[PDB]
Amino acid sequence: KIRVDIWSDIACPWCYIGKRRFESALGQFPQRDQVEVVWHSFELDPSARPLNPIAMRDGLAMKYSISPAQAQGSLDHMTQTAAQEGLEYHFDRVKLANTFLAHQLIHYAAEQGQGDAMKERLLRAYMSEGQNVNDLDTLQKLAAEVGLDAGAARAALEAGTYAQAVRYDEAQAQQLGITGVPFFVLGGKYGVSGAQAPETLLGALSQVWAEQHPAPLTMLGDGQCAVP
């Protein structure tokens, strides 16, 4: 088996792009059926307001200390880059929301085996559909759309059941020195930082598989100690 651990935030447009590029890599990888993907929570800003009412362009200009004109250029760059992955972003509608609860929903979804579908739904909701992913009504609806028990999912969020697990995900990311997303860990050994090309993630997948299935030695030929 091949384990891939990915840290990601719903609020990061490169994460959605990265998910597509990784999916492109996976499709080209002969041993794709032996890959287990595990999504991990990451928050760009764990202390963000529940909902910041300012335009994404402005939040970006403030956070990164540049002009509104440059912040827009960056938005325009990300939008066109995403389009090449089949993603139609709508940054003008983005709700700058705290993503803690949304990550919790992903953890709930994963216990039902629907982690990736939930992650996908939420990325779309944030990046394209102008939805507020800190809002419980919205989160419950999205869960229903994924095919989850909407009542159970909402109950889980109100209880904060997966709150601890999200914090541990983030703690683990911090302990690994992961300070930006998306971040890929392959074979619990190799790291790939950022939304890298499919070729790069395929080469990582390929390199890891090779290490786990190296070419069989030719044996030649008074004892040994063997582990039982």
Q: Identify the CATH number of the domain in which residue 135 sits.
A: 3.40.30.10
Q: Is residue 216 part of a domain?
A: no
Contact 202, 18 (CB under 8 A): no
Domain span holding position 168:
1-209
Using the structure block, give the residue that is written with the tokens 């914090």. Answer: 167
Q: What tokens does 89 get?
A: 């972003």
Q: Is residue 227 part of a domain?
A: no
Please give the C-alpha separations between residue 166 and each of 109, 141, 173, 175, in angstroms, as whole numbers: 13, 21, 11, 14
Helices (H), the chain: 13-28, 56-63, 68-83, 100-111, 115-127, 136-146, 150-159, 163-175, 198-212
Tell me which residue of 17, 37, 38, 39 sits closest to 29, measured CA to CA. 37
Resolution number, Å: 2.0
Which experimental approach was used here?
Answer: X-ray
Q: Is residue 157 part of a domain?
A: yes
How far is 217 from 228, CA to CA, in rounded Å? 22
* 126: number of Cβ within 10 Å: 27
Torsion of CA 193, 198, 204, 209, to 10 degrees: 150
Q: Is residue 226 part of a domain?
A: no
Three-state secondary structure string covering 72-134: HHHHHHHHHHHHCCCCCCCHHHCCEECCHHHHHHHHHHHHCCCHHHHHHHHHHHHHCCCCCCC
DSSP secondary structure code for residue 221 in this structure: -
DSSP-assigned beta bridge partners for residue 167: none
Q: Is residue 215 part of a domain?
A: no
Q: Is residue 224 part of a domain?
A: no
How far is 92 from 56, CA to CA, in rounded Å? 7
For residue 60, count CB atoms less than 10 angstroms from its CB and return exposed for 0-12, middle for 13-18, buried for 19 or more.
buried
Tell me which residue of 200, 225, 169 sits closest to 5, measured CA to CA. 169
Q: Is residue 69 part of a domain?
A: yes
Q: Is residue 53 part of a domain?
A: yes
Q: How many domains does the chain have?
A: 1
Residue type, 177: G
